[PDB]
Symmetry: C3
Subunit: 608 residues, 3 copies
């Protein structure tokens, strides 16, 4: 008769289970809890870095340009037999009396050179106090004053060597720069001075390093400087230093050391700096600069910092300013400011805050912020902050992803527990399909009260199943079968079995499934890889799944992967671009300069 038109499936005989095998459903699981969560402290921060910048100040130089030339005369020319140039230090006396008082300078220089007291005379005449005319126009320089525009040369005497002295008294304002430990400094002209710029008398600054004779240094109390250009006196009374070097004299207003230098520099003021304790370490996170710093749980004492006067003062001046701008009505200062040393060598000044609304915790926390209180050297700061920003970025994504998937993991678990209650009611309705989906294999099931009995199924080949043409019971008219009759064999050569088709291609051995006849009885029955269609209890034809419209119970979820991505090296200016930005390269110049003999002369030839 009729075999299956679709052979791409299996049939199963499903005998009733005895109770030899019994199973139960797993009870609901204890669901994970959301973590308590990191507690953040609100605070104002000031981050500090290593000071790499030198101390800078204003200074004035006083010297003279002593030039002695030697000229020869012939027919009819002249030729310098030599030009001797030297720098003569202007003694304290002339500066205060001739310059700063009148604006004039001497036409004579007198100084110590190579262990002899030499004396020069401008124009080889005698003393004459000469006004200090401003220096010629030159951009990006300080002001300057000279007394003579010209070099003096001897009158012509044929076939003779004559000498001419020139004296130009020079006063220029210069910048001075000193580096740690501030025991010597340099001028804009390139001259070194081997003394601390804080060497004076007032207070204990006479302890500073000097390498010159005591008589080279003098300090004037109440020194009223007079602008050599506007001829104006100074309304302010400044203390003024004067050191006389072998080549010059340097004047500058003296100032105390500590309130003027610092081995630390204020870097970032942070309005909202959240501190969380995490792992026996502190995390100072700033949303505004995307930076997270890591420190120990103990403060760093500023008494361990060499020359760190500016730290306390700068940290307070900012915090007060910020507190008054942002928190002057919303929070409360909890304790004095704190200082922690962060990885990378950053010093963090921190002022814990507490919300007005939660003021009931002040004491509880005030005690805590006092636990961290501190019971000389130099801090070294890295040049790259990128690690602390990697930290910040990573922590933030990490915290978010873990939070969210954590929530999903819980919601997933709750839903599994809840749906068990549906599975429990479903299993009574259709023990076979439920048990099969639960276990993972087509089995036969039957409730034994509260547990579920399970027996295995037996496969039957598709070509071994024949469906009978009719569904009407001839013996007792007025009654028919609900589902079609079938015949089959387990093995290919075996005998036929009288059976009835059940759901899911199950072959039932009892033909008991009986219903009273009806009109227009049209049914589709699952049969093989498709359906068999009956019309009024008579076989019509078979058909395929594709012939019937499909609708889904499934809820779509469209997850795609985040693709691989390659980060290439990328620099704004490469290390070489930075080197080449310098206008002159000392090394390059010296290398050429010192090749000059080799390139253009002969250092390996003696004449006799």
């Amino acid at each position: 008769d009729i075999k299956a038109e679709n052979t791409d499936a299996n049939f199963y005989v499903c005998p009733p289970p005895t109770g030899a095998t019994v199973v139960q459903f797993e009870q609901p699981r204890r669901c994970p809890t959301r973590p308590e969560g990191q507690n953040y402290t609100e605070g104002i921060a000031v981050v500090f870095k290593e000071n790499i910048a030198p101390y800078k100040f204003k200074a004035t130089m006083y010297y003279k340009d002593v030039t002695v030339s030697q000229v020869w005369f012939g027919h009819r020319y002249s030729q310098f037999m030599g030009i001797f140039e030297d720098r003569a230090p202007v003694p304290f006396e002339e500066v205060i009396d001739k310059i700063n008082a009148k604006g004039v300078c001497r036409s004579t220089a007198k100084y110590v050179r190579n262990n002899l007291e030499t004396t020069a005379f401008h124009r080889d005449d005698h003393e004459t106090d000469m006004e200090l005319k401003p220096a010629n126009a030159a951009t990006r320089t300080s002001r300057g004053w000279h007394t003579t525009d010209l070099k003096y040369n001897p009158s012509r005497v044929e076939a003779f060597h004559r000498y001419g002295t020139t004296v130009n008294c020079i006063v220029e304002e210069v910048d001075a720069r000193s580096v740690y430990p501030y025991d010597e400094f340099v001028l804009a002209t390139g001259d070194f001075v081997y003394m601390s710029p804080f060497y004076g008398y007032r207070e204990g600054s006479h302890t500073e390093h000097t390498s010159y004779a005591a008589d080279r240094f003098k300090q004037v109390d109440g020194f009223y400087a007079r602008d050599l250009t506007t001829k104006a006196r100074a309304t302010a009374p400044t203390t003024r230093n004067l050191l006389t070097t072998p080549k010059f004299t340097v004047a500058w207003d003296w100032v105390p050391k500590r309130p003027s230098v610092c081995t630390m520099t204020k870097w970032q003021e942070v309005d909202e700096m959240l501190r969380s304790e995490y792992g026996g370490s502190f995390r100072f996170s700033s949303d505004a600069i995307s930076t997270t710093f890591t420190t120990n749980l103990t403060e760093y004492p500023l008494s361990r910092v060499d020359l760190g006067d500016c730290i306390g003062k700068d940290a307070r001046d900012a915090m007060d300013r910020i507190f008054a701008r942002r928190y002057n009505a919303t929070h409360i200062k909890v304790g004095q400011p704190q200082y922690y040393l962060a990885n990378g060598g950053f010093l963090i000044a921190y002022q814990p805050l507490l919300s007005n609304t939660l003021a009931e915790l002040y004491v509880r926390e005030h005690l805590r912020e006092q636990s961290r209180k501190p019971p000389v050297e130099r801090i070294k700061t890295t040049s790259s902050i990128e690690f602390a920003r990697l930290q910040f970025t990573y922590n933030h994504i990490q915290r978010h992803v873990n939070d969210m998937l954590g929530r999903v993991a819980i919601a997933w678990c709750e839903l599994q527990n809840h749906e068990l209650t549906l599975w429990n009611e479903a299993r009574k309705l259709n023990p076979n399909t439920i048990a099969s989906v639960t276990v993972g294999r087509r089995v036969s099931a039957r409730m034994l009260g509260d547990v579920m009995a399970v027996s295995t199924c037996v496969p039957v080949a598709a070509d071994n199943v024949i469906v009978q043409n009719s569904m009407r019971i001839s013996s007792r008219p007025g009654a028919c079968y609900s589902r079609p009759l079938v015949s089959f064999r387990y093995e290919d050569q075996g005998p036929l079995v009288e059976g009835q088709l059940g759901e899911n291609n199950e072959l039932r051995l009892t033909r008991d499934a009986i219903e009273p006849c009806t009109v227009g009885h049209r049914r589709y029955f699952t049969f093989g890889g498709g359906y068999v269609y009956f019309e009024e209890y008579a076989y019509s034809h078979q058909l395929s799944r594709a012939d019937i419209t499909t609708v889904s119970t499934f809820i779509d979820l469209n997850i795609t992967m985040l693709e691989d991505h390659e980060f290439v090296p990328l620099e704004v200016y490469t290390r070489h671009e930075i080197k080449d930005s310098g206008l002159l390269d000392y090394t390059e110049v010296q290398r050429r300069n010192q090749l000059h003999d080799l390139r253009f002369a002969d250092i390996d030839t003696v004449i006799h």
Copy 2:
């Protein structure tokens, strides 16, 4: 009789609910929608940075080495009483006529020094034009030419001071470098020249800065240079400059200023630069360099840029080249190129594109790209691009994570809405278990049509429950109980209640649960923390959950957390390694050099 073998659970009496308390299920919720999503513009980009590189050019120096020595003679030695060295500037005349025309130089130097016209004679003889032999072998230098290899010294005259003049005419090619604002420059020898390298006559370049006398400068139109080595003339006619300084004369081919300098440098050409509007700002993202830039919605006018000629020209030359390589058949140029200033001080040249397939929007968008059109100073570029790459990385992960969890949130909601339809049918089947799971507490339920009536349950201690030995009804044989009989008391000292065991350890008060007897009736019934097993309506024994095979209805989901991770500071070369890479340190050298008197002499002793 028989108590519970497992006392680790609860029993509940569940009286029928009246209707005093009624509940309903929450209707389906409005599910969230997926956001519309950022629209990206396809475009070609050229990113620009601050130009930190100086202008560089070729120059030739012309000077002479005037050396006058003084020697003394004894028995039987010689000793230099002095050596006077000077650099004599070669006048325009000799360069064009003797050098560039023949290759020879004069044996005499004549120049201005200390306000006197001096004159030198090589070998103290008279004029003699001397060929310019190439300079000696020296690596990594330019070429050079000198006329004399030797210094001339006077013939021996016992007990006498004699003088000897030496003249070496020198011509070397040198590199020149100038920095913004290009009003002076330096040579490779270290010499400064206080004039703009664009100072000439042609066009309006006579306006450039100079600080020398007019007669120091001359320019030759059509200057045919002659290679002093190969003796070859220049086939090309160049305009040539000549400035005469107090120490030398510098020659170099003159060129216009604007098409030769720029305060900006092309940094990255970007094939695909996506621009999205987001937050009243633009985002220029480049997948290729992993960089996202942030700019305002308005272009930056190039008319605000000082010396930015190269920007327009370079930006176009690249975009055209790229368009022709990649988009010459796929897209359409939309408007002229645009320029936006990005955070960090990056100038972005941008050319919007439009896909051929979507050409119907040209006008619609062409109008938009014209809205941004612009209706002198210096741009400052940071050295660190890392922020814009942090930006890029973060945005990309952010966009992906939000997209995906967004989808989950929707799919989760849809599934909750869908399953309600199962809960609705389940509640009819087992109002007690469904109501209990829904509320959260063991209650008793009953449908009142479309709402659900709920009463509370009553707990009964485990030790207060006894299960009867039989399940057979003695009064009417041929009928038995479905579930075992029980007896219990609410309070420990109270009286016994005739009852029947229901599902989930419920104690039913009516013993109505009756079924017709059967053969082989074996049932497991939930009882306490385990099951009670009956066989043919007679008590067999109790047992524990562990005694029965467990199968799960639950679908596993294995979510683990992304662990904490610490980013340490890491530098390739530390700030100090970069300092020390320099071969000579000017500061270190000067500090030693200027200590020399102090270390090896006496600057504090006068002899008389």
Copy 3:
């Protein structure tokens, strides 16, 4: 009679479906698998960078300070007519014999200058061997020795020019520095020396670059140096070099070249460096420094590296040390160390490891690590490692997110497949509501065996529905209706239809829904946007959803988005701060220094 109190809903007439339209549920889907996952190799790494640091060594200088002064006398002063200073190279002879043997130096200098053999006499007397007293106190300098503290000046002779010679024999220890390609070097004093620091005799180091005469260089085998301060000889016998320049003589112990220089520097030792193959490239990831490097699958041969002796030696010395500390009992070395060149110009030395527990794969993998084995130039290393840390951070988050959502996608799919089994049983119970939720529209459904027949519903306006007051059947007492009677019309002007209220506001056309009467029959029935309440089969009143307590079947899931975040540019020290940290700026100084004539004199005036 009674209309709906809540008009905010719809009613539907749901006629039985014929079988004209039939649907089926979508079968379970094939669920995605978890990917196999990247396999990591455990290994020890040593990362190498470009060596930017010069070669540094100790050197001694030997020269003399020859000073000849000229003084004039008057009434009653003195004035230097000139001071000639020169540096005289100390010949090999005096250093070994007078200095290194006794500690004394000559009072005479004899040397070659400007092609003449000059000779100087200290104090203008004759030879006298003078002890070398230590140099004066000066911080941060090396030691030094001079013979004379004073400059000698001639005795006073009125109206006469007299000359005085001074000789100071000087010996100072200096540091020397040379850069690639190491063919010349510099001293701390700033002097250049144009010879390779490896120029000697022993081995083939006579091939090094020199630019001086052969007689300028001498090497002493077995040179026992004597400390000029402690008067102590050297117990060690060193080979010693002596080069004599025109200005000085430099001595230094000679050493071989290759084992002393390198164009590469060890940067990071990495304990655990995981290597994975991914995309025809290798990924070397280090958890400890948060860095992921990218290389080709082929080793880089060290034979392609110029002067890379240190690489092999340093890479082994560390790996052995580390292996012995960490893996001396846990893993096995697999092959000789390997070298790969990574993007950014990093050289990675790698030693693959294998866990003892998985030793069965040695051969299988030993063969593989030999496939990569290599069958001169300079490597260039970027200054920024940030890209490889971006890489690391991104990959790690990427891997985690994809893993987890991947798992969710699978678990989601499995749950959809599992719940179908519930939907299958539910549809028999309530074909109307199930079919409606499945399709998406209120339809009418009926099972046709195994498929489901579906017809559309018809909407009826709310104001068109009237609910009858009673529920009792007058004709046959002892029986009532389960759900209320209703009357309605499809169109507003149409006729009334006798009908019964079903679930979900369906209007049933057959009034068959009949139950036997009961006492206390109180029911709530869905009616419009609320319920209608009956009490003992008689209409009571209507009410709203809000009047009844709501309980939810829904499981909450609380997903929030990860917000936008802006990364601002942030630098620790800006490019300008780094420039200004230098104490002296060569360029700044030279610019001032060379302005001095222009500012303070006149270079444009001839006197006659």
